[PDB]
Amino acid sequence: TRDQNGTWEMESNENFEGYMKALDIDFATRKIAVRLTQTLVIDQDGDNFKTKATSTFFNYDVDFTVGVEFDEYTKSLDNRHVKALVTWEGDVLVCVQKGEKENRGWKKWIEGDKLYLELTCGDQVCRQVFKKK
């Protein structure tokens, strides 16, 4: 399904450190972030997404429209300019963030009862699994 609506609670988080290191997130932020449970809130209506990722100490907002390129200033992460585009490849939602970092973006998809989020940067891949609240 393409329906990714809901409140999603983190089950697993594999190689978050490697992904964050590839982004040049500072040491101290990485050490805290890797231990925290994330909650993802996704409001999806047609092509319009409003999403939030939240933890005890960090929060990451991003809204986008599928198929509409948008500039991003990742000021809370690694503080870079990227040109972002989110599109569907089958039932996989694919974000490419064009900029300095190669292979930067993510892929989100539903498999049974779970939401998968694959974060990429450089040679690093982080795989997160969420289940609905």
Residue numbers in the entry: 1 to 133
Published text:
Human cellular retinol binding protein II (hCRBPII) was used as a protein engineering platform to rationally regulate absorptive and emissive properties of a covalently bound fluorogenic dye. We demonstrate the binding of a thio-dapoxyl analog via formation of a protonated imine between an active site lysine residue and the chromophore’s aldehyde. Previously, we showed the utility of human cellular retinol-binding protein II (hCRBPII) mutants as a fluorophoric tag, wherein an active site lysine residue (Q108K) reacts with synthetic aldehydic chromophores, giving rise to the formation of either an imine (Schiff base, SB) or an iminium (protonated SB, PSB). Q108K functions as the active-site lysine and forms a Schiff base with the aldehyde, whereas the K40L mutation is assumed to eliminate interactions between Q108K and Lys40, an interaction that could otherwise impede imine formation, and is also required to promote Schiff base protonation.
Subsequently, our investigation aimed to alter the polarity of the Thr53 position, which makes a water mediated hydrogen bond with Thr51 in crystal structures where both residues are maintained. The T53A mutation also red-shifted absorption and emission, but far more modestly (5 and 3 nm respectively, compare M4 to M1). We next turned our attention to the entrance to the binding pocket because our previous studies with retinal showed that introduction of aromatic residues in this region leads to the closure of the binding pocket and results in substantial bathochromic shifts.
